[PDB]
């Protein structure tokens, strides 16, 4: 939900730690153009521990 995003040559880098990773809030946004997942399944992200 950030208002201003960074360019592709200077992409931002946020670190997620010490929090409950509830990926259900991601689906609340607009329909995605590409939701490809590599090495993980998009359905079982809420049960994994990273």
């Amino acid at each position: 939900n950030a208002t201003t995003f960074a360019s592709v040559y200077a992409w931002n880098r946020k670190r997620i730690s010490n929090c409950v990773a509830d990926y259900s809030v991601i689906y609340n946004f607009a329909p995605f153009f590409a939701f490809k997942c590599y090495g993980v399944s998009p359905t079982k992200l809420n049960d994994l521990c990273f």
Partner: protein, 50 residues
């Protein structure tokens, strides 16, 4: 005198080393993303985890 009973010691050491190699090959990921079946089944879908 040392190495007097080396014949039986060699046999038992070969057996122990074969067992250690067999148990160490379990942790070797042969091209897979992980060496644990639980880390693959609980992370990937069946058609991709197979």
């Amino acid at each position: 005198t040392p190495s007097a009973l080396g014949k039986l010691q060699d046999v038992v050491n070969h057996n122990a080393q074969a067992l250690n190699t067999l148990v160490k090959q379990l942790s070797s990921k042969f091209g897979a993303i992980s060496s644990v079946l639980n880390d693959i089944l609980s992370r990937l879908d069946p058609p991709e985890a197979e």
